Design an enzyme around this catalytic site. Structure first.
Site, mmCIF file in Angstrom:
data_model
loop_
_atom_site.group_PDB
_atom_site.id
_atom_site.type_symbol
_atom_site.label_atom_id
_atom_site.label_comp_id
_atom_site.label_asym_id
_atom_site.label_seq_id
_atom_site.Cartn_x
_atom_site.Cartn_y
_atom_site.Cartn_z
ATOM 1 N N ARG A 38 4.640 -0.355 -1.684
ATOM 2 C CA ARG A 38 4.088 0.502 -2.183
ATOM 3 C C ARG A 38 3.110 1.622 -1.727
ATOM 4 O O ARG A 38 3.711 3.046 -2.110
ATOM 5 C CB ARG A 38 3.500 0.362 -3.091
ATOM 6 C CG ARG A 38 3.807 1.678 -4.930
ATOM 7 C CD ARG A 38 3.859 1.296 -5.888
ATOM 8 N NE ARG A 38 4.025 2.321 -7.150
ATOM 9 C CZ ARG A 38 3.126 2.852 -7.817
ATOM 10 N NH1 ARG A 38 2.240 1.424 -8.908
ATOM 11 N NH2 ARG A 38 4.263 3.412 -9.030
ATOM 12 N N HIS A 42 4.291 5.971 -1.029
ATOM 13 C CA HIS A 42 3.185 6.748 -1.881
ATOM 14 C C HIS A 42 2.360 7.644 -1.077
ATOM 15 O O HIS A 42 2.067 9.247 -1.547
ATOM 16 C CB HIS A 42 2.158 6.260 -3.458
ATOM 17 C CG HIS A 42 2.482 6.170 -3.902
ATOM 18 N ND1 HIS A 42 2.965 6.013 -5.229
ATOM 19 C CD2 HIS A 42 4.624 5.917 -4.344
ATOM 20 C CE1 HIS A 42 2.550 5.590 -6.427
ATOM 21 N NE2 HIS A 42 4.360 5.847 -6.174
ATOM 22 N N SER A 52 -3.188 10.640 3.156
ATOM 23 C CA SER A 52 -4.098 11.570 2.232
ATOM 24 C C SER A 52 -4.324 10.400 0.982
ATOM 25 O O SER A 52 -4.969 10.841 0.277
ATOM 26 C CB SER A 52 -2.840 12.690 1.552
ATOM 27 O OG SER A 52 -1.722 12.388 1.802
ATOM 28 N N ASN A 70 -0.038 6.704 -9.458
ATOM 29 C CA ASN A 70 -1.047 6.340 -8.728
ATOM 30 C C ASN A 70 -1.917 5.444 -9.882
ATOM 31 O O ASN A 70 -2.714 4.752 -10.004
ATOM 32 C CB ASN A 70 -0.948 6.221 -7.515
ATOM 33 C CG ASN A 70 -0.720 7.251 -6.479
ATOM 34 O OD1 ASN A 70 -0.002 6.494 -6.092
ATOM 35 N ND2 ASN A 70 -0.869 8.387 -5.658
ATOM 36 N N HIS A 170 12.659 -2.765 -3.903
ATOM 37 C CA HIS A 170 12.162 -3.893 -5.615
ATOM 38 C C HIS A 170 12.930 -4.806 -5.516
ATOM 39 O O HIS A 170 12.581 -5.093 -6.589
ATOM 40 C CB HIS A 170 12.433 -2.788 -6.253
ATOM 41 C CG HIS A 170 11.967 -1.511 -7.211
ATOM 42 N ND1 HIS A 170 12.455 -0.588 -7.350
ATOM 43 C CD2 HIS A 170 10.256 -0.729 -6.549
ATOM 44 C CE1 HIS A 170 11.830 0.716 -7.305
ATOM 45 N NE2 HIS A 170 10.686 0.406 -6.797
ATOM 46 N N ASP A 222 12.807 -7.553 -9.297
ATOM 47 C CA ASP A 222 13.685 -8.815 -8.872
ATOM 48 C C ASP A 222 13.379 -9.860 -9.824
ATOM 49 O O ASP A 222 13.023 -11.058 -9.571
ATOM 50 C CB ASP A 222 14.363 -8.640 -7.562
ATOM 51 C CG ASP A 222 15.146 -9.891 -7.350
ATOM 52 O OD1 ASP A 222 15.188 -9.982 -5.616
ATOM 53 O OD2 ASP A 222 15.715 -10.858 -8.285
#
Ligand code: HEM
Ligand SMILES: COc1cc(/C=C/C(=O)O)ccc1O
Ligand SMILES: COc1cc(/C=C/C(=O)O)ccc1O
Ligand SMILES: [Ca+2]
Ligand SMILES: [Ca+2]
Length: 306
Positions: A38, A42, A52, A70, A170, A222
């Site tokens: 993740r 992001h 960044s 975040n 996911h 899940d």
């Protein structure tokens, strides 16, 4: 051009160091692999995969860590520092944080049982963080399919296969009750639960996320294989068991004419899903990268050099 062999001469053991770091962390935190993937996501959706997102606050710019997407959500940053320190020891000033995070995401997927491949490398680190760009670019769980598609297209991913395949992230990981409360008790101010959520699963989720309960409680994305990266995430969608709104829309949205066949395709074949995920992952990893002499090789992923 980014290339998978970028460090084969300068740091041939970078992938190995990253893997060992994740394997060790997974023993005390089985969620770290999902968290790392993740972070890469992001990172890439905000000015490209330039690390960044790893930058901390400065008096000149705010950290992306405080973005709605975040804040009190993104995690694993200390783990990234650990593998970075290890890589810097093995090969000083060689591997960028942006590339490190890319490899870390690929290794996390593989360690979770996902596909294995060599990600393109050669990205360099940004000289600033983009908080506003993060709040505007990161897609939200309450987005409709059109918004989700617009979100991806905005960063450079025009293909519905990108969205459907990358959404497979996911297949593991956790989600807070906070982001499904509307689906469980009052969706779109209708005073009713989201009709696209299986009624039996609805009851289960309501038990985990009672009204007026702990909104920070964690729920698995899940219900089939919570920590295993596989195509089960899509089987759930076919049964209206996607956890968040943005998941189920890929199959239930009135605008899902193009995503439905993709969902079924990935649900029917692991090989088909894995191939698409790798392809989509590398496309996301190719979003506006800094290369050559642009940007730098950050020594501490949290701050710009010197
Ligand atoms: C399509 C739009 C997407 C939306 C709206 C979305 C939204 C979210 C939300 C709400 C969470 C829960 C955060 C929390 O409870 O703190 C989350 C977690 C997660 N997402 Fe997504 N996501 C999207 C795309 C993706 C993509 C492209 C990937 C990566 C390929 C990804 C990987 C993950 C993982 C692994 C977690 C669990 C992290 C953990 O447990 O630490 N997401 N996402
Ligand atoms: C944590 O895993 C590893 C660390 C190193 C370190 C090499 C060095 O410091 O020169 C090499 C290979 C590994 O698999
Ligand atoms: C928790 O994860 C997310 C949250 C948001 C937005 C939240 C808000 O607008 O309140 C957007 C993207 C995310 O991935
Ligand atoms: Ca970024
Ligand atoms: Ca799974």
């Amino acid at each position: 051009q980014l290339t998978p062999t970028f460090y084969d001469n300068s740091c041939p053991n970078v992938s190995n160091i990253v893997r060992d770091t994740i394997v060790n962390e997974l023993r005390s935190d089985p969620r770290i692999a999902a968290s790392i993937l993740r972070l890469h996501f992001h990172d890439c959706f905000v000015n490209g995969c330039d690390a960044s997102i790893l930058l901390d606050n400065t008096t000149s710019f705010r950290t992306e860590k405080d973005a709605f997407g975040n804040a009190n959500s993104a995690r694993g940053f200390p783990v990234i520092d650990r593998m970075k320190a290890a890589v810097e020891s093995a090969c000083p000033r060689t591997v960028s944080c942006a590339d490190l995070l890319t490899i870390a995401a690929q290794q996390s997927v593989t360690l979770a049982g996902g596909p294995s491949w060599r990600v393109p490398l050669g990205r360099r680190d940004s000289l600033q963080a983009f908080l506003d760009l993060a709040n505007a670019n990161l897609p939200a769980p309450f987005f409709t399919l059109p918004q989700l598609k617009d979100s991806f297209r905005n960063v450079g991913l025009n293909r519905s296969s990108d969205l459907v395949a990358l959404s497979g992230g996911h297949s593991f990981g956790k989600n807070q009750c906070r982001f499904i409360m509307d689906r469980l008790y009052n969706f779109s101010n209708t005073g009713l639960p989201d009709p696209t959520l299986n009624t039996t699963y609805l009851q289960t989720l309501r038990g985990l996320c009672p009204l007026n309960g702990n909104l920070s409680a964690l729920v698995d994305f899940d219900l089939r294989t919570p920590t295993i990266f596989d195509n089960k995430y899509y089987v759930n969608l076919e049964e209206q068991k996607g956890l968040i709104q943005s998941d189920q829309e890929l199959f239930s949205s009135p605008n899902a004419t193009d995503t439905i066949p993709l969902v079924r395709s990935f649900a029917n074949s692991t090989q088909t899903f894995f191939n698409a995920f790798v392809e989509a992952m590398d496309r996301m990893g190719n979003i506006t990268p800094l290369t050559g002499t642009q940007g730098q090789i950050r020594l501490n992923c949290r701050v710009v050099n010197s």
